[PDB]
Amino acid sequence: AISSMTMFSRILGFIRDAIIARFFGAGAATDAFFVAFRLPNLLRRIFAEGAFSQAFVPILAEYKNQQGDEATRTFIAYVSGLLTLILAIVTLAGILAAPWIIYITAPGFTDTPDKFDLTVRLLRITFPYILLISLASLAGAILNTWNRFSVPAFAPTLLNISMIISVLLLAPYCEPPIIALGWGVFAGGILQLLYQLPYLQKIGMLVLPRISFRNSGVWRVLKLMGPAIIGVSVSQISLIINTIFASFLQSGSVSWMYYADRLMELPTGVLGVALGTILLPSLAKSFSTGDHKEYQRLMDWGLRLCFLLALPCAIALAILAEPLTVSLFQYGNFTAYDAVMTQRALIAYCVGLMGLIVVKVLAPGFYSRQDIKTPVKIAIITLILTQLMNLAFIGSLKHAGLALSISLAACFNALMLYWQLRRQAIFSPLVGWGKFLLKLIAALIVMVAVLLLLLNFMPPWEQGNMLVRITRLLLVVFAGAMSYFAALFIFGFRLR
Numbered sequence: 001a002i003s004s005m006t007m008f009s010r011i012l013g014f015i016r017d018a019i020i021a022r023f024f025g026a027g028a029a030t031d032a033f034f035v036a037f038r039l040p041n042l043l044r045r046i047f048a049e050g051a052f053s054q055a056f057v058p059i060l061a062e063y064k065n066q067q068g069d070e071a072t073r074t075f076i077a078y079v080s081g082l083l084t085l086i087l088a089i090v091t092l093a094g095i096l097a098a099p100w101i102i103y104i105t106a107p108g109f110t111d112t113p114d115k116f117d118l119t120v121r122l123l124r125i126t127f128p129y130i131l132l133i134s135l136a137s138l139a140g141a142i143l144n145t146w147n148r149f150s151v152p153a154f155a156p157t158l159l160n161i162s163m164i165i166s167v168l169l170l171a172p173y174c175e176p177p178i179i180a181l182g183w184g185v186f187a188g189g190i191l192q193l194l195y196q197l198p199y200l201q202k203i204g205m206l207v208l209p210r211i212s213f214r215n216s217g218v219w220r221v222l223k224l225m226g227p228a229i230i231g232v233s234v235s236q237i238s239l240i241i242n243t244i245f246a247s248f249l250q251s252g253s254v255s256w257m258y259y260a261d262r263l264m265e266l267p268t269g270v271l272g273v274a275l276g277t278i279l280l281p282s283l284a285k286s287f288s289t290g291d292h293k294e295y296q297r298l299m300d301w302g303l304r305l306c307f308l309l310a311l312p313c314a315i316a317l318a319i320l321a322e323p324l325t326v327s328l329f330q331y332g333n334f335t336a337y338d339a340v341m342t343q344r345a346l347i348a349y350c351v352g353l354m355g356l357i358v359v360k361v362l363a364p365g366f367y368s369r370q371d372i373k374t375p376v377k378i379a380i381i382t383l384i385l386t387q388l389m390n391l392a393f394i395g396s397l398k399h400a401g402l403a404l405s406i407s408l409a410a411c412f413n414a415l416m417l418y419w420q421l422r423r424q425a426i427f428s429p430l431v432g433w434g435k436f437l438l439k440l441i442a443a444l445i446v447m448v449a450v451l452l453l454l455l456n457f458m459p460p461w462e463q464g465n466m467l468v469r470i471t472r473l474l475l476v477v478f479a480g481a482m483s484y485f486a487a488l489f490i491f492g493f494r495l496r
């Protein structure tokens with residue numbers, strides 16, 4: 001369900017990314033678009049996922065299960081109304097203050113004033129999407145409360161489609177061509193909304209928004225939002241300051257980081273969705289029922305699974321950074337220089353894939369423990385270490401150093417959450433990790449050896465059509481995966 005539609009969305013997101021790279025490359029225009037659209041949406045996502053979504057899903061289901069459909073319709077009406085009012089005000093203030101928002105977020109764009117102007121213009125086109133995508137994600141949250149998961153998963157396909165179409169059709173018309181993306185995004189917003197509204201009507205939860213300050217449920221969802229806003233703020237501030245750092249770097253830095261991060265995202269989302277259906281449900285159940293012993297059992301199996309699957313992915317992405325970048329991005333305005341810079345950023349990002357997967361495996365269980373004080377402390381530490389690693393790595397490695405900083409920060413964040421579990425006896429690993437790690441290390445050595453060998457005997461990656469390059473890429477990915485799994489088979493792990 002989710003596993004099929006959210007990954008169709010994934011190839012279309014990656015296809016739109018390749019289209020962007022092909023048509024606009026990695027430079028001033030693409031830098032401006034990323035700071036203008038991606039950075040505000042990421043702040044918005046952090047806020048909604050960290051505070052609004054966490055508060056909204058329990059209260060909504062609690063209405064749905066303990067009160068009628070009419071009471072739930074009224075709750076949803078007042079929630080969507082207050083959301084729309086706040087976001088309309090927020091959007092209006094943002095379009096007015098856009099030059100100051102770009103100045104604070106990306107100070108270094110001021111050196112090319114025309115680039116700063118495009119970033120401001122694109123934020124003005126972009127900003128209405130915040131409203132649209134928030135309404136669409138509220139729709140999707142409601143539908144998920146009604147156990148309809150495939151529609152909200154498929155919904156971002158419409159954004160990807162809209163952006164691809166705006167690039168292919170509207171870009172030559174638009175006077176700065178990447179302006180077209182904005183409108184695609186805009187159309188995308190509307191489409192993502194329009195697609196989900198009838199399904200909402202299907203469950204009788206499509207209702208005209210309405211404003212009130214007396215609703216008990218609205219104040220409940222406002223109260224559970226409170227303690228999470230400090231951590232949301234930490235994460236937002238860190239991301240803002242990272243962008244500030246990158247803004248002083250050479251044009252394309254933001255775009256190179258973006259492309260590397262998407263390349264690196266690609267398998268990590270697969271693994272995250274897959275472990276979120278194999279492991280997290282049973283972990284949540286074990287924590288809710290108070291079964292400590294078998295919670296440890298799953299925690300250990302899941303951490304071993306993380307080492308078994310995220311490590312080979314990270315190392316393979318590092319070894320295959322040029323194959324991947326050249327085969328998936330190096331067309332049109334994406335030059336060979338852009339490909340090298342993206343390769344470096346991708347090698348840097350590979351360090352933190354492990355930290356990402358483990359943060360997603362450990363963080364469920366703290367929000368369930370209702371311990372937010374120690375994660376907000378961990379988040380402040382992660383901020384401090386991130387900004388410090390930025391100062392340290394920016395001069396020597398530039399954008400790659402900023403990517404290394406983000407990666408190592410994710411590593412330390414996961415490590416600190418694990419240390420909190422270890423100190424409070426929340427988790428203690430099972431015996432036999434040592435020989436298990438040795439098995440991994442041998443299998444990784446075999447995999448990397450086979451990959452290096454093949455690459456020495458395989459053509460220059462720039463040479464060929466996209467069919468040819470992606471065929472070669474898939475051939476080496478297959479040989480590497482096969483060889484890693486064959487080394488593992490000799491060691492053991494015959495069944496899961």
Ligand SMILES: CCCCCCCC/C=C/CCCCCCCC(=O)OC[C@H](O)CO
Pocket residue numbers: 096097099100103110
């Ligand atoms: C927190 C600040 C709140 C400010 C509220 C202002 C309300 C009126 C806004 C007009 C925008 C239209 C004009 C857009 C260009 C303004 C020039 C500017 O400030 O640009 C930055 C500068 O270029 C860097 O070097």
Ligand SMILES: CCCCCCCC/C=C/CCCCCCCC(=O)OC[C@H](O)CO
Pocket residue numbers: 011014015018019022267312313316317328331473477480481
């Ligand atoms: C153990 C191994 C771990 C590493 C695993 C690495 C996976 C590499 C696969 C990539 C295929 C996914 C991307 C598919 C891209 C389709 C082609 C495309 O993007 O075409 C756009 C073009 O510009 C239109 O004009």
Ligand SMILES: CCCCCCCC/C=C/CCCCCCCC(=O)OC[C@H](O)CO
Pocket residue numbers: 415
């Ligand atoms: C050139 C770049 C260098 C490439 C790398 C060379 C290999 C270095 C050695 C690895 C041992 C790793 C040991 C740790 C692995 C499992 C994690 C662990 O033990 O964590 C304990 C936890 O922190 C509770 O305090």
